[PDB]
């Protein structure tokens, strides 16, 4: 007879990343309808979307083309500059003192309690995005889970992670004895996908020129809201989500949903974590959920999709056209910087830094070195940005190949100085 807790985190901001905060708000409504209490649900979101100037319906958020508002009622626990990696860890550990700013709500859980964690944004190999730097590094996240387990302040925990290369956050480092079960949107090397976007099928209402959701996220949320959670197992949800996210085993506009931690937890019913909604119990015959294939966009290209459609539907015309050209060239400049550093170190052909480790291995052996090499890069080449998280394997392999900090500095200066 425990208490059910939850942490909902959006790791991004900006109207181009509408979907991520819409994902989280939708997740909150599902938990509330299921009977979870607001005091037991901590929400971390930048909160810049609902009243964004570009929002055609101010004060609302939708996570589906024909969907209703999901923004109303969502608590403002940690918004704006308080959405940090440090606050996320502190909330999860339930240490109210370590929290800086915000409402001060934390997961002060007890040994018999259940915890549900859901992250949604951007990502890269070994890294999860945050709207305020520094980003989340996998080792710090796993270590936080270890301390939480050591305190023994929970019975079991389930974690859902929506991000690109999200499997890399847990592979090679996530233990199976922490009473934690984890699912991720993709494996350690592949892209994730956003959905309900303009120019595709299905599309949002024409006034929306940005993506409403993400494939993996809307997969489990639409699943939970249309099924009896007293009957459905975690095992069944994983199976359904994996199938939809893979675009039904075609992997064309789809990714590989991965799982980590203790798999025996999968036998349990979803209501122990997500609550139970009586409305879903014995639905009439003609209202049973029927799912079909949906168009998607690469998670890292959803930004460009937003800028291009805003250009098409439009002096705001060229302000957007100019922002499109500048964004494109900034990304290519950043790609060139990483490529040049790799080329300087190990050459332009069969570059050793581009080698992907076998499934099951950790991305990097020295995680503190990974942080260090990123700082060196940013000191010379400028901020890596959330887009630049795609290049994180290059920095990881610099550490794995034992390249010293001095040589990285030398290569970074030659590549970006001037
Ligand atoms: C993996 O998770 C299970 C629970 O799903 C942990 O618990 C075992 O299963 C029964 C279920 O009632 C418990 O009462 C026992 O205490 C556990 N038995 C054994 C043999 O473990 C299980 O311990 C977890 N495994 C690990 C390695 O932590």
Residue numbers in the entry: 48 to 361, 366 to 469
Direct quotes from the study:
The plant cysteine proteases of the legumain family (C13 family, EC 3.4.22.34) have an important role in processing and maturation of seed storage proteins within the vacuole and, therefore, are also referred to as vacuolar processing enzymes (VPEs). Plant legumains are structurally related to the mammalian caspases and exhibit a strong substrate sequence preference for cleavage after asparagine and, to a lesser extent, aspartate residues. Seed type legumains like Arabidopsis thaliana legumain isoform β (AtLEGβ) play important functions in the processing and maturation of seed storage proteins within storage vacuoles. Structural analysis of plant legumains showed that they are synthesized as inactive zymogens composed of a caspase-like catalytic domain with AEP activity (AEP domain) and a C-terminal death domain-like prodomain (LSAM domain, legumain stabilization and activity modulation domain) that are connected by an activation peptide (AP) harboring the α6-helix.
To understand isoform-specific differences between different AtLEGs, we determined the crystal structure of seed-type proAtLEGβ to a resolution of 2.0 Å. The asymmetric unit of the tetragonal space group contained 12 independent molecules. Like isoform γ, proAtLEGβ comprises an N-terminal caspase-like catalytic domain and a C-terminal legumain stabilization and activity modulation (LSAM) domain with death domain-like topology. Overall, the structure of proAtLEGβ closely resembles the structure of the homologous two-chain AtLEGγ indicated by a Cα root mean square deviation (RMSD) of 0.49 Å. Similarly, in the crystal structure of proAtLEGβ, we found all twelve independent protomers in the crystallographic asymmetric unit to engage in symmetric dimer contacts, which were mediated by LSAM–LSAM′ interactions. In contrast, the proAtLEGβ dimers in the crystal structure were predominantly mediated by the α7 helix. This interaction was formed around the symmetric H384β (H392γ) and further stabilized by one symmetric salt bridge (E390β–K383β′) as well as by a hydrophobic contact of the α7 C-terminal LFG motif (396β-398β) with W355β′ centered in the α6 helix. However, modeling a proAtLEGγ-like dimer uncovered repulsive charge densities of α7-α7′ helix contact residues in AtLEGβ (R380–R380′, K373–K383′, and D369–D386′) that will prohibit this γ-mode of dimerization. Together, these findings suggest that the observed β-dimer is weak and probably only transient in solution. Comparing the crystal structure of proAtLEGβ with YVAD-cmk-inhibited AtLEGγ, we found that the AP binds to the nonprime substrate binding sites in a substrate-like orientation, similar to what we previously observed in mammalian prolegumain. Gln346 is binding into the S1 pocket in an unproductive orientation and thereby preventing cleavage of the AP and further blocking substrate access to the active site.
